[PDB]
Structures are given as structure tokens and as C-alpha cells.
């Protein structure tokens, strides 16, 4: 399913992402916009044989198991298909693990390129919660 901006803002907040690892909620909403266009089922194959999955485009190399990323880990202990669910609980859980591994949101290219050092507050502007 495809989220709207404030709809995603609430869903990420609900799931503990406001200010997690010190990333304001807007960073996360921003990230998803440019990672997945807010679509919970976005996948994007990488040349290294991994795939990015879901609203936050979590990668199979380290974070989720999709059973076809050679020599990979599953550090969020989830199948990559959990990250494609309309319910973003697993995606957010996993993203929290990613930013907690010392790479922070630099893990996500679209954050680095379209959110970091920007007015990410704009992505939550006018939202209830
Ligand atoms: Na994996």
C-alpha cells in the first residue's frame, strides 16, 4: 500500500521513530519518500545480489532474510517479505536496528541525498501527531 505523508508520519511515530537515534520523525518520512515513494511493497534489486525492501528499503545483505542474497545476514531476524507489509511495524523495527548499528541514516542513499541537512520538519508539517 502507498502511504500519504502525514499518514506515514503517524505510523512511524506510533512505532517509536520520532527522535530515534536522534533522527527527528521528519528524517524518516523524508527517507521513505525518496526510498520507496511511500509504497510498502517497493523492492529494488542491487548489483551485489541483495534487494531493498519496503517503505524504508531495508537491504537483504545484512538486515533481512529473502533466501537469495548470497552470504548475507538477517540481523533484524525477519523475512524480507515482512518489510513489504502495509503494517510498517517490522520495517520500523528493522530501521531502528540499522540506525543503531553506527551508520545512522547514512545507511540510506535517498536520506543522504534528499533529507540529510534539510528542513525535514517540512515532512511532518501540519500533521496531527
Ligand atoms: Na539476508
Residue numbers in the entry: 1 to 129
Wording from the paper:
At 950 MPa, the crystal symmetry decreases with respect to that at lower pressure, and the space group changes from P43212 to P43. The a axis of the new P43 crystal corresponds to the diagonal (a + b) of the original P43212 crystal lattice. Four molecules (A, B, C and D) are included in the asymmetric unit of the new P43 crystal, whereas these four molecules are symmetry mates in the original (low-pressure) P43212 crystal, which has one molecule in the asymmetric unit. At the phase transition, the four molecules in the asymmetric unit move towards each other. In particular, molecules A and C approach each other along the c axis. However, the corresponding r.m.s.d.s for molecules A, B, C and D after the phase transition (at 950 MPa) are estimated to be 0.57, 0.70, 0.72 and 0.63 Å, respectively. However, a large deformation of the β-domain is detected only for molecule C at 950 MPa. In molecule A Glu35 takes on dual conformations, as in the 890 MPa structure. In molecules B, C and D, however, the side chains have a single conformation and protrude into the cavity to hydrogen-bond to the newly present water molecules. In molecules C and D additional water molecules penetrate above the previously present water molecule that interact with Trp108 and make a hydrogen-bond network between Trp108 and the main-chain carbonyl O atom of Trp28.
HEWL is one of the best characterized enzymes. Its reaction mechanism was discussed for many years, and was settled by evidence for a glycosyl-enzyme covalent intermediate at Asp52. Crystal structures of hen egg-white lysozyme (HEWL) determined under pressures ranging from ambient pressure to 950 MPa are presented. Under high pressure, the crystal structure of the enzyme undergoes several local and global changes accompanied by changes in hydration structure.
